[PDB]
């Protein structure tokens, strides 16, 4: 294995992956959208 | 220039700092302690 030529590459890849995962977690925690599933109502008139 | 670990180290340091900052932000978001500053009470038995 070539010293200081390939070893640093793996560490850089791992660090980039971890940073991407952390930023994705932050984005998901802060502003994840929420979906509406069901519907129910009881309004004046004949609405049921 | 010097071998090839003349620029990779800077990128490694930058990535490590960014990862540390992101994890710090996660920790502050999810577990920030809250301090109590003042308190008032009104209880029976003449307590004021």
């Amino acid at each position, epitope marked *: 294995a070539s010293t200081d030529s390939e070893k640093v590459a793996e*560490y850089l890849r791992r660090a980039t992956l*971890d940073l991407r995962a952390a930023r994705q977690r932050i984005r998901e925690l802060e502003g994840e959208p929420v979906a509406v599933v069901a519907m129910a109502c009881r309004l004046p008139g004949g609405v049921s | 220039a010097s071998t090839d670990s003349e620029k990779v180290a800077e990128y490694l340091r930058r990535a490590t700092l960014d990862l540390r900052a992101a994890r710090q932000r996660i920790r502050e978001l999810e577990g920030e302690p809250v301090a109590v500053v003042a308190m008032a009470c009104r209880l029976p038995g003449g307590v004021s």
Partner: antibody
Amino acid sequence: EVQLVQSGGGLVQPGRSLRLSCTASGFTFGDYAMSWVRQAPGKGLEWVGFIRSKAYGGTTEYAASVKGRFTISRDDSKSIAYLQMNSLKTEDTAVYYCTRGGTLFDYWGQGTLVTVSS
Amino acid sequence: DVVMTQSPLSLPVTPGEPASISCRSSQSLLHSNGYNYLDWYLQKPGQSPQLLIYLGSNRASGVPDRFSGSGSGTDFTLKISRVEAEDVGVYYCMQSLQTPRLTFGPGTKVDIKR
């Protein structure tokens, strides 16, 4: 996601031949370098071989008790790593692992028994 | 180039209180870039090995926050916070100055104190 599976393994008499298949999915297989490790049944973990990447080209180096015994093979069309077996020995009976990375041993495989007896 | 854990090979533990595993080395690593080429690995009973912390103390994703490394270039030591269930197995100290690594090492066992 990133999954690694291993196939090929069973009972073989001394002096036989075999190959092992490591399958990768979920990442660009070209950049990373594959490495094979072996754990004896009741002992520690000992490194076996390590194949470089086509970006640096290169080949493996193997180690003692394995150099000149059997070779490696790596493809790119379907990202399937191959470990050849030549003149298997009884002491070689041990579980085998295929894992990502050449120096930093990242996400691993699942293992295969591969026993040798008569 | 020779590293032995020097930590208690048995190291009985009990949940609640934390623990630590020392890792004494030969001459320090201190690569010119300014890092220590030391890693940690954990092996569960009957499971595939997995990585915990690479160079220094920058534990990768998926690893629970209860783990934390530390140490200088010749006195590495891994700190574990409040102990829980599992985490029983073999822990390995790994160097990176010499590429042709043969054996991971004897490792240190972990088991419940009694």
